[model samples]
Target: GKICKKTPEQLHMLKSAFVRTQWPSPEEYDKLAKESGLARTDIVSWFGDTRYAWKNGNLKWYYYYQSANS
Candidate 1:
């Protein structure tokens, strides 16, 4: 079973970090997981879900700004 539900604070932190880089390296994920106290799978799933949302045009504009710029 999962440890616990993600808190609003946790989600906010995740979003802030995620916006900086859509895809983080494995080591980076590990570091984020440790600091944020989120499971690695949760971190990976968040990116996967957001990417899917972006592909389907459901994500906000800021989520794609970096991609658009590059």
Candidate 2:
């Protein structure tokens, strides 16, 4: 299958998880899969790419929305 582009809502959920834990365990993967409605493969790939971005500092911190709504 072609790459499945995640929705903004799903991306937000994934990014939030990424912020909390760059590496999520299998249990958290299940929760992310359930909440994001993305397959495990997708979640895995997302983290893989995200981690690479983090390593290279290609991803800006501002890209993450740290809200006060919490």
Candidate 3:
């Protein structure tokens, strides 16, 4: 499947949500999808990449720490 290119605005909103919570519930995902004009799968894929990177030690220590603490 072709990857969708997210705009800066989409990224900004996603990052805000990401920093606030690593795991958003289904309802939250639905709301985010509606607000960002992105598909639910897009939000899922973004978090999937983030989680994969974190688990593989690809992300910075601070992010890992923050995610762990939150």
Candidate 4:
């Protein structure tokens, strides 16, 4: 079983769970598994959910900006 160390949003974005800018390849997967201290299967499961969120829009996006003149 996988340990619960990541928040739902973190897991959805695949951000905090692992540190990689792009999707993991075979070697990346292995490296991430070691770095994350999680099993490859667990990492894969989280990624699957991440992809689902992107497709389903369960995740929303917003832009942060500052006013030039305030």
Candidate 5:
């Protein structure tokens, strides 16, 4: 299978777009979309939502990792 990797420019653009709403609440997708000039779908797909659960060793923020490659 061929892996479609993002170019540097595309990666940069994605990073910038994500940064605009990095820690927004779930309800703030519309606001982020309007502010970043990106679609609400894009915002929701990219940043995802926060996950809070107790772990024995370490805690990590988990993003809903969809099968984007499919």
Candidate 6:
């Protein structure tokens, strides 16, 4: 059970970020946090889980994004 399920827009930004970045810095977290309205901790878990999920195939791009596009 996700304690704080992220919205698609929020997840999109994160995904977009993970494309070119791995771990985020303190200043980076604050930047993303300010715009996304999420805390540094939340951003931390999102990236961690997203990375694990990508490697483990627990999450798919179309699983949520493309599937609902139509």
lDDT of 1 by residue, 1-70 (tens): 4565887788787777777888999998998899889999999999898888878888886556667867
Off by over 4 Å in 6: 1-4, 62-70
Name the weakest run of 10 consecutive residues (lDDT summed) in model 5. 50-59
Candidate that scores best on TM-score: 2
User: What digit string (tens of lDDT, one per residue) describes model 2 on residues 2-61?
Assistant: 374888799888888998898999999999999889999899899999999877867775
- Model 6 steric clash pairs: none
Candidate 5, 1-70: lDDT as tens digits: 4363444554455455444545667667676566556677765665542212312322222232223322
lDDT of 4 by residue, 1-70 (tens): 5586764544544564333333678877777677656778877877777667746765343111112323
Candidate 4 stretches with Cα past 4 Å from truth are 1-13, 16-22, 61-70
Error of 4 at 58 (Å): 1.3
Q: Once model 3 is optimally superposed onto the true structure by TM-score, how far is the C-alpha of residue 25 displaced, in angstroms? A: 0.2
Q: Between 1 and 6, whose lDDT is larger?
A: 1
Q: After superposition, how far is residue 3 of candidate 5 from its true place, in Å?
A: 14
**CA error at residue 37 for candidate 5, angstroms:** 0.3
Report the C-alpha lDDT of model 6 over 1-70, residue by residue, as the tens digit: 7764887788777777766676778788888888887787999888888778877878787356547866
Task: For residues 1-70, write the lDDT of model 3, one tens digit per residue.
Answer: 4365998899888877887788999999999999999999999999889878867878685375577887
Determine which window of 10 residues in candidate 6 has minimal summed lDDT: 61-70
Query: What lDDT does the true structure give each of the candidates?
Result: 0.82, 0.84, 0.84, 0.57, 0.48, 0.77
Clashing pairs in 4: none
RMSD of 5: 10.5
What does candidate 6 score on TM?
A: 0.67
Model 1 gets an lDDT of 0.82
In model 6, state the lDDT of residue 50. Answer: 79
